[PDB]
Write a protein that binds this ligand. Structure first.
Ligand SMILES: C[C@H]1CN(C(=O)c2cccc3[nH]c(=O)oc23)C[C@@H]1C(=O)O
Length: 167
């Protein structure tokens, strides 16, 4: 039993809710919240900008130190950093950004990072300003993640479409 509430069950291990991931993190304090990161951990907009804003920019400060030490992430890769006031940990995962011309096949590699964590609160990777089709992202999620994932979808219209079209 866990504290996630109001989710629709899509499969044995994947759940979905129309929710603001920031507000959901603030209420649940999950062990892991996933950020929709880029390779530079520059949290300017989309999910990343919202999560970082909710930490009063502490996520960005920590991220800048991480990059100064380690260099950029790989597209499809991840790193574990603090969850600040939102979660125990933040798993920063880089899905391909279609608006940068990155290979969409890397979306499966990106979701594989979730399997290193038993339970996660997450957004759909590569959705939103990353330019991928969220229906496809949901399909890859379901077909790749084996651990327990609670997906927060900000847009109610998109949420309804994702549910109604789910196979
Ligand atoms: C397509 C993504 C983009 N996105 C946000 O940008 C966002 C998330 C939480 C709070 C916020 N306040 C704000 O102004 O923007 C946000 C959440 C969407 C999703 O994952 O469904």
């Amino acid at each position: 039993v866990n504290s996630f509430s109001g989710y629709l069950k899509l499969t044995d291990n994947v759940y979905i809710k129309n929710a603001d991931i920031v507000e959901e993190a603030k209420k649940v304090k999950p062990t892991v919240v996933v950020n929709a990161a880029n390779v530079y951990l520059k949290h300017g907009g989309g999910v990343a900008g919202a999560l970082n804003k909710a930490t009063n920019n502490a996520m960005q400060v920590e991220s800048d130190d991480y990059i100064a030490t380690n260099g950029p992430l790989k597209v499809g890769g991840s790193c574990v950093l603090s969850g600040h006031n939102l979660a125990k940990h933040c798993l920063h995962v880089v899905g391909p950004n279609v608006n940068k011309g990155e290979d969409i096949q890397l979306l499966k590699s990106a979701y594989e990072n979730f399997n290193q964590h038993e339970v996660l609160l997450a957004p759909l990777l590569s959705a939103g300003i990353f330019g991928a089709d969220p229906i496809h992202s949901l399909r890859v999620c379901v077909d790749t993640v084996r651990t327990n994932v609670y997906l927060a979808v900000f847009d109610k219209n998109l949420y309804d479409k994702l549910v109604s079209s789910f196979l």
